[PDB]
Amino acid sequence: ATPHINAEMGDFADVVLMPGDPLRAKYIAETFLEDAREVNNVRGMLGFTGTYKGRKISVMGHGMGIPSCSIYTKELITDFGVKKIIRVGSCGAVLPHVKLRDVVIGMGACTDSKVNRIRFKDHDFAAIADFDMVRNAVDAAKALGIDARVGNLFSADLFYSPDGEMFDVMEKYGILGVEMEAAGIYGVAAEFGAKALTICTVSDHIRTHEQTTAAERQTTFNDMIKIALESVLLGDK
Amino acid sequence: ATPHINAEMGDFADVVLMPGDPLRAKYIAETFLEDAREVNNVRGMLGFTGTYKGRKISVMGHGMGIPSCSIYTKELITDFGVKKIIRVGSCGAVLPHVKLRDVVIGMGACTDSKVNRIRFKDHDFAAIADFDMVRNAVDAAKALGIDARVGNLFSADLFYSPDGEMFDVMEKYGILGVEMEAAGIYGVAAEFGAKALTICTVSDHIRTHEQTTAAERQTTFNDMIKIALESVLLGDK
Amino acid sequence: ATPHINAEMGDFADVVLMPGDPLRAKYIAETFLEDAREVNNVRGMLGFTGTYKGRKISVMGHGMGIPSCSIYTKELITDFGVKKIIRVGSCGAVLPHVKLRDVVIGMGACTDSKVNRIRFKDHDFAAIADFDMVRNAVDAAKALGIDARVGNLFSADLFYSPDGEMFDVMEKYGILGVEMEAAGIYGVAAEFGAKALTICTVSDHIRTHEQTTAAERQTTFNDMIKIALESVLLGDK
Amino acid sequence: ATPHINAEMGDFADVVLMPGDPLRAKYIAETFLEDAREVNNVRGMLGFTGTYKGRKISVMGHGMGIPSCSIYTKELITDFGVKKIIRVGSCGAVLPHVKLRDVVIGMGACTDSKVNRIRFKDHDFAAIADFDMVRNAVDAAKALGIDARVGNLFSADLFYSPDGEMFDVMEKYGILGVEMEAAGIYGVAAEFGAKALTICTVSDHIRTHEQTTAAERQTTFNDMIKIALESVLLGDK
Amino acid sequence: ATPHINAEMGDFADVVLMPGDPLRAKYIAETFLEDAREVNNVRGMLGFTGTYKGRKISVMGHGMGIPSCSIYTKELITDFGVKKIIRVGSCGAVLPHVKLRDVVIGMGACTDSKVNRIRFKDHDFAAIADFDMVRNAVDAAKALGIDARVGNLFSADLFYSPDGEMFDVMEKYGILGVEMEAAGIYGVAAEFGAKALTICTVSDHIRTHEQTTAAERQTTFNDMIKIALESVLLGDK
Amino acid sequence: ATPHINAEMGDFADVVLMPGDPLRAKYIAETFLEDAREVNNVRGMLGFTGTYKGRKISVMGHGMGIPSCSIYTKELITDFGVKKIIRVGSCGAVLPHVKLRDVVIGMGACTDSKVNRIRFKDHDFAAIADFDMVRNAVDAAKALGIDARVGNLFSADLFYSPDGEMFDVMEKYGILGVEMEAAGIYGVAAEFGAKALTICTVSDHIRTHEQTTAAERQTTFNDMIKIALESVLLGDK
Ligand SMILES: Nc1ncnc2c([C@@H]3O[C@H](CO)[C@@H](O)[C@H]3O)n[nH]c12
Ligand SMILES: Nc1ncnc2c([C@@H]3O[C@H](CO)[C@@H](O)[C@H]3O)n[nH]c12
Ligand SMILES: Nc1ncnc2c([C@@H]3O[C@H](CO)[C@@H](O)[C@H]3O)n[nH]c12
């Protein structure tokens, strides 16, 4: 057990999918895994372990923001033998050509957090995913006939930015989606010698009016989960 | 409703107690409030409203870290008429004389987050509690015969900090507790025009490594809750 | 003697009032203290010791700016047994409702100086007053029937700031007065293990350009001095 | 023509290989390209355009360091229609398992330069390559029987850094190679909406301080160029 | 009149010598000027105007530190027609070959203050003297047979540095003297279009044991004043 | 030999002129030096050593930007006994009174590079020339009937800066010319205990965007080289 996870070694698979919402973790386990059992409930941050096509898989919420997800990913890696984290989240779009429901794979993650500067002697650490995990996700998406854009996410500390001006900058520099965790998770993975990937679906456009349905949004969210799970099978190789 | 809170104007009292742990919010509502009703379940971030000695009061979790609590506190203030936030949590001590279960009142909160620099043109914003709220908590503690220290907290972005030597600096500058939220809540209070206070119970010692269990950091921090609730009554008069 | 103070241990009371203007220190000693003797003349930074209602008290100028007051406050603390510093000056208001001659009590002090970053590993140190001293000043003011606001000061390095737009940010974050010393004194107090408080009288309005003369900012700020002196008596009990 | 390139729109292919040693351009043109013509000679920075297996390719040196390569890459993109830049150089290794002559592909590039902070409002821009270009290079290398490592480079402003300890930090965070340009080229690519990749051969160990032959050096350089050129063909499909 | 100077236009010469100590200003006026009259006494910051060899000259203390001297130099320049400021101060040595009583001319001034970054969009402003003033001082020193070293000063915000480690850095980079004002004065001169120079005599060695007499120190201080005054005559040309 | 210079101790004179355009080295050697011999050719950065009026002088290009020139200048100083470096280039003017073909002498160099902050513990290092070298150049120019302006250069990392507004700030603070190397060379000179000077001819107006001929360009270049060479002779006495 750790301060934030009341589970024992072996309770987690060596791969963990992580949405921000713990209720979403339960959703994923019930929807996609067989024989899933709850393995954590401390602070309501539900975690589960089951199988996907015979492969042992865990899923657990990471909460909102770099500081929250940094706690859980660190403990999973150092205390629970976890080798890969796949964050499966939502993000906001800033580019006109990135649409609601687009699947976005964060090969890198920009941030306005100070956590990586603290790690990296106040220089610029390029917070990046594991290349093979990125490749596995791209390939799984292709096999599923799902379009996926690979590029930079922006991990924001403030969902409610006092700025606003930063959005034009993100767009100019080609950021695919704004979320709150990827850069933190990538920093943890680098710090502790594990591998991580963030995939998101665009749930909002931080600057426009697009129309979709709940059934379609939920379908795409599930496609993201299928991509993540299938990407694991490809990596297992 | 707001993006992270499924409730309507009036569902919350104008004062909200907020532990980081939504399960602690549940404990508080069951233990200290009368006629408590659950008013939010989104993301499992439980929130309740009831009365304490006839005074309407809410309690809701804020999650771990500045980015998480910044979302909830902002939404409460801008959309739910909330005027005062009292954070009630846990912190780790760095001073030798500070002991487990000690109550600390954060008149100020240091931080290694960038959020206040982003608000304050990269200068030093002194993240401070509302003075009357501090005095109210001090007086309530005195009436309850509970010892409480008033001074600076340190709101860390990384629970697992790579910079161990920073604790020596915190100790040197007399930091009473290390937690992860106060500076962000104080920043939100100033930005959105409300008032806030953080009270913490020392749950672990960063030097001695002595600590309390998760179950204890959920259902046994009663002194702090009593001080918080009684301080509201003082504030009303 | 210390490098900037030609006096000996015991020449100063354990509490020192410090205006920025050494001529104001002279005024205070002549007006409010009994049996005042001059104890320092170095650099014309006049310092006196006498009694107020039988209580031994000193008053000495600290000069303008963080670097100046940091010298004097450090030397008093490390070599003259001084336990409490009460800065008594002047500030400019940015809030519309704050008026000339208003008394403000700086529970916190924001700053654009680098001195606290240099102390605090480039993180945000919340430069805060001693809580008991704040409460003492509030109570003394109430007993004197003098209105006083408690909150953040902003300690500027440049009286003539090239960044006019920063005043809008100060106003936005509810800064009560702009002065040039509090954050530095609070930093010294924490570094060298003493206690401090800054009380200011609003001497000018940064927006309206209304202001008081030099002669007025030397010999007519009596409310603040009375509050300061009476707050010491409260602290003793 | 542009300030540093005396050529006209159309003189460059849409893909440009760029070595850091300007003498390498003529070498690549003569050894790998057919029907090459000279298209720039300003400041001795020879540029050539030719074909590789029918496909139009240009090659021109970029000079050492971020500021030099930022000039040439910007001009190529904005004034010469260049869509893809492949930097082909040399790097020093800090990781024990990374050895001389290893091929490294910079999916990301860390840096101690300020250029991306200047671009990105002082936040962390994750300077990244184009994913497809990265995968093309990985695949091209594999087809050539060369195993390539993919991860972060570190783009240093000072070849002679006074900060010895930074190398240990780079090692801790899994930096594959130290060079001086990638983060700058990636910043320009994002700023001006093009695609870039840096491929490096390990020429030295930062610690071990060994190496490296000139023949083995020439063979490995040829391998890198072949990888780069074949990667373009894969990119075309 | 200005907020810190109770004098009228024309009361100051177009050149002002400025020691930090207002009593030293009086010393200089009485010792070196004919018919000197006091023209400011606000806050005890004595200023005088008289003649040196028929040339109109003013001298006035600037107080300790960048924020203090920035006020006075700004007002002198914008409100009193002052064209040149010559700071005449003391400094501490860090280099083994710089000796007590050496005369140091600050062609540049390093600093740990944030004031120039605030002016200069957070980049590095090289705080420099006016070249002709430097040349005039060098020439006047030569005519007087006085040795003078020209190089960098370091203007510190904290006379009592918590660091200490910064002194080895200053020495490595060849800093000639540590004082507290030059960089601030040079920033003001640049901001407001005037000319400035700092000359110091080494009054202490921040790291050694040297022996001199009071008569010798006072002699050298006067030599610095002669250099400053004679340099003015040379500039008048 | 060093990593970037294939030569041995003694191959370079103690004084080296360095243009930014490498083709200029052979030009200077053939046009101004007698009995010149080639001493470096690595990476095409030709270096020559010869005499000017009997005095040994070397000349070698430095490449564009701080990182490139920092490599060559460091190696020259630490491994080739070089005592003085004179950079001879080109700069853009932002001041209206500074015109094309004007000679500018950088007594100081501002910068947006991070290299000196990295050297100087994140404080402001005033990157300065050697005073005697500055005065020699001023005197050499005057003897040639050329009026030279002495003041600050600005050494930019990005020739193509996304920050348009910085040019107005440079103008406000009296920057004489914008180039890309001086602050870096001055930083290296201070780090390794040598002496440096940058002299530039104004080749463009940043705003006006005019210029500049090639003949008038060649004449002015010759004038700069003559100033540089004659300045060395003055330096020798
Ligand atoms: N426009 C946006 N900005 C920031 N975060 C998010 C998200 C994700 O949802 C959460 C915030 O609602 C957080 O976990 C973040 O990763 N969706 N859309 C977002
Ligand atoms: N030693 C410690 N360091 C940081 N945060 C905390 C806490 C609080 O508990 C949570 C992390 O366990 C988070 O909300 C923080 O504010 N308790 N002990 C802590
Ligand atoms: N508008 C203003 N801005 C900055 N400081 C001050 C002050 C105080 O007075 C001094 C400057 O006049 C200095 O000590 C500062 O703390 N009064 N009004 C001020």
Ligand SMILES: Nc1ncnc2c([C@@H]3O[C@H](CO)[C@@H](O)[C@H]3O)n[nH]c12
């Ligand atoms: N250990 C090292 N550090 C920095 N750069 C390099 C290089 C490359 O070589 C050049 C400097 O020698 C520059 O272009 C850089 O990218 N090889 N080995 C390097």
Ligand SMILES: Nc1ncnc2c([C@@H]3O[C@H](CO)[C@@H](O)[C@H]3O)n[nH]c12
């Ligand atoms: N070692 C030292 N450090 C900082 N300042 C000074 C001085 C000058 O004296 C004052 C501090 O005593 C201040 O005005 C500064 O410029 N002398 N020696 C110094």
Ligand SMILES: Nc1ncnc2c([C@@H]3O[C@H](CO)[C@@H](O)[C@H]3O)n[nH]c12
């Ligand atoms: N407006 C300008 N901006 C930056 N650099 C330069 C130069 C010099 O020319 C090179 C860039 O063209 C580089 O060496 C720089 O120092 N001339 N005009 C310039």
